Design an enzyme around this catalytic site. Structure first.
Site, PDB file in Angstrom:
ATOM      1  N   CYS A 362     -21.676 -15.898 -28.592  1.00  0.00           N
ATOM      2  CA  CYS A 362     -22.214 -16.449 -29.850  1.00  0.00           C
ATOM      3  C   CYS A 362     -21.247 -16.426 -31.048  1.00  0.00           C
ATOM      4  O   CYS A 362     -21.115 -17.410 -31.774  1.00  0.00           O
ATOM      5  CB  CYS A 362     -23.586 -15.830 -30.220  1.00  0.00           C
ATOM      6  SG  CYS A 362     -23.727 -14.005 -30.437  1.00  0.00           S
ATOM      7  N   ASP A 474     -26.301 -23.341 -35.185  1.00  0.00           N
ATOM      8  CA  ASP A 474     -26.629 -22.293 -34.211  1.00  0.00           C
ATOM      9  C   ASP A 474     -25.753 -22.367 -32.967  1.00  0.00           C
ATOM     10  O   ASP A 474     -25.874 -23.296 -32.176  1.00  0.00           O
ATOM     11  CB  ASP A 474     -28.105 -22.418 -33.808  1.00  0.00           C
ATOM     12  CG  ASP A 474     -28.595 -21.250 -32.967  1.00  0.00           C
ATOM     13  OD1 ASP A 474     -27.993 -20.977 -31.905  1.00  0.00           O
ATOM     14  OD2 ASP A 474     -29.594 -20.608 -33.370  1.00  0.00           O
ATOM     15  N   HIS A 476     -25.721 -21.037 -30.186  1.00  0.00           N
ATOM     16  CA  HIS A 476     -26.343 -20.883 -28.871  1.00  0.00           C
ATOM     17  C   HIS A 476     -26.760 -22.240 -28.308  1.00  0.00           C
ATOM     18  O   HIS A 476     -27.759 -22.840 -28.742  1.00  0.00           O
ATOM     19  CB  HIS A 476     -27.530 -19.915 -28.937  1.00  0.00           C
ATOM     20  CG  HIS A 476     -27.257 -18.675 -29.739  1.00  0.00           C
ATOM     21  ND1 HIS A 476     -27.553 -18.579 -31.083  1.00  0.00           N
ATOM     22  CD2 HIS A 476     -26.712 -17.485 -29.390  1.00  0.00           C
ATOM     23  CE1 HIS A 476     -27.205 -17.383 -31.524  1.00  0.00           C
ATOM     24  NE2 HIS A 476     -26.691 -16.699 -30.517  1.00  0.00           N
TER      25      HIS A 476
END
EC number: 3.4.22.-
Length: 517
Positions: A362, A474, A476
């Protein structure tokens, strides 16, 4: 009695940038629709016919000289298009749309927008320069090259598109409307193959040739543009080459680049002298900044910053990656005052480089995003590192804010600023200096969540009510490389202050860009 339209703010900002004996300038625009696109200021040295021709060859093919400008009645005037802007230094420095309209009755202020698709093709040619006669041949090759261009043909096979000379009656109306409809020049690209009928120093030039596809124009209109587009690139190559000869840098080969300078709504096209010395190049970049009224606080014309519109063009970042996803948020929601990230960047995430960082990567991804911003903004040419390469600076370890700042410091000689927080709802009481960041350093921000890492692209701050939102990319991964799956889902969208966990403590790394480029 005729209406011209201009973006006066844009103009003022250009004067601003040059300023950064007297001053005059040229006015470039779309002559048919009486719309000014570029106001270029220059000191009296540079108000030469030589520089006028350099400027015009660098602008998009639909744009030409439409007029010039006189500041305070005491600037040098070089005739000419079909009008003169009357200007004062008061007006310019104060930026009074107010005053500009009174001095120039036929003009209307307007916030001119990007428009159209970019057609592009690789084109090559060969030029022979007689020993000691390099200068006058290069000039002459160009002229005969411009009489030859009316015979080229451009072809896209995946769509059965052909641009080619044609009798007016043969014209196919609305010829690319399907492609150019709500298109934008910096990323909606129809690529063609350029072709021709099969019926001392030798110099070889190959490179992009880009021309605008506007919604609603006829295959004929497309042809006249492609041709002018090609001729300007040749003249541009001619001019840079001659320049280097007169400077005794020899006969240099060039690289073709296309840019969209900050603020601009039509592209800038340049043949770049890339066999000069690194220093001689920097000086050219500086010269070019002055000529095109670019701003001096940062790089604009580094090879690394050139759009890669043609598939056979050399890029420094992966073609598969998305550029600026946050610029696909059509469903806007402005709660208050928005400060956003400054330049362009790419979107890195899970499952990308053929790897699988389902839990640990991440923060690597956010590191990669921050990295991509530094190439796409002309600060390095070194490619974004792989996990393993970041690590070298164990294997398969998740990491966080503190090493991100460190890897950045010795892979990039890059200094950061830190923002540390006791609670997720203390991110907010710090939104002031976080907005201040974006308006200055303007780099993406890595937010060190507690178990997680995110990138912050901007804020939505209302200093009255105090309500605060956050633009979050984000790391992810969820999609393939689909824009809708990223914009519809929450992978790139705005978030409320109730997004940060209040129980936990958050760290923030704030990349600082260097001070000369």
């Amino acid at each position: 009695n005729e209406l011209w339209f201009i973006d006066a703010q844009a103009m003022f900002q250009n004067y601003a940038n040059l300023r950064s004996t007297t001053i005059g300038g040229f006015v470039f625009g779309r002559k048919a629709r009486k719309q000014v696109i570029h106001v270029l200021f220059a000191y009296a040295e540079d108000l030469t016919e030589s520089n006028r021709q350099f400027l015009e060859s660098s602008l998009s093919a639909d744009i030409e000289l439409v007029g010039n400008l006189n500041i305070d009645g005491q600037s040098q005037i070089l005739p000419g298009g079909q009008f003169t802007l009357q200007l004062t230094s008061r007006m310019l420095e104060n930026r009074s749309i107010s005053e500009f309209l009174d001095m120039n009755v036929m003009f209307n202020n307007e916030h001119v927008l990007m428009e159209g698709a970019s057609c592009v093709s690789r084109v090559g040619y060969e030029w022979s320069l007689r020993a000691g006669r390099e200068q006058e041949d290069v000039k002459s090759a160009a002229e005969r090259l411009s009489m030859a261009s009316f015979r080229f043909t451009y072809l896209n096979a995946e769509h059965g598109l052909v641009i080619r000379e044609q009798k007016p009656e043969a014209a196919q109306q609305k010829y690319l409307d399907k492609f150019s409809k709500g298109a934008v020049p910096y990323k909606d690209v129809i690529e063609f193959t350029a072709m021709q009928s099969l019926t001392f120093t030798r110099l070889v030039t190959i490179g992009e040739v880009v021309f605008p596809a506007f919604f609603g124009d006829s295959s004929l209109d497309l042809y006249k543009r492609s041709r002018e587009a090609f001729n300007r690139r040749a003249n541009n190559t001619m001019m840079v080459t001659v320049n280097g000869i007169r400077a005794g840098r020899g006969v240099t080969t060039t690289t073709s680049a296309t840019y969209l300078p900050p603020g601009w709504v039509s592209l800038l096209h340049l043949q770049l002298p890339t066999k000069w010395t690194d220093n001689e190049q920097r000086n050219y970049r500086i010269r070019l900044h002055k000529l095109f009224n670019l701003p001096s606080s940062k790089p604009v014309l580094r090879l690394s910053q050139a759009l890669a519109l043609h598939s056979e063009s050399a890029r420094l970042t992966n073609k598969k990656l998305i550029r600026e996803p946050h610029l696909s948020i059509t469903n806007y929601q402005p709660v208050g005052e928005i400060t956003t990230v400054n330049g362009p960047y790419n979107y890195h995430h899970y499952m990308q480089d053929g790897i699988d960082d389902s839990g640990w990567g991440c923060a690597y991804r956010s590191f990669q995003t921050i990295w991509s911003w530094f190439i796409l903004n002309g600060y390095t040419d070194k490619p974004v590192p792989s996990h393993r390469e970041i690590q070298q600076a164990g294997s398969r370890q998740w990491i966080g804010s503190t090493e991100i700042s460190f890897v950045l410091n010795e892979l990039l000689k890059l200094e950061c600023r830190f923002i540390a927080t006791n609670s997720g709802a203390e991110v907010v009481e710090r939104v002031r200096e976080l907005a201040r960041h974006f308006e200055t350093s303007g780099t993406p921000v890595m937010i060190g969540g507690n178990m997680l890492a995110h990138t912050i692209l901007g804020v939505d701050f209302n200093d009255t009510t105090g309500e605060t939102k956050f633009l979050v990319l984000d790391p992810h991964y969820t999609g393939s490389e689909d824009i809708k799956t990223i914009t519809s889902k929450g992978w790139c969208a705005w978030k409320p202050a109730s997004f940060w966990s209040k129980d936990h403590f958050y760290n923030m790394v704030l990349p600082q860009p260097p001070s000369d480029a």
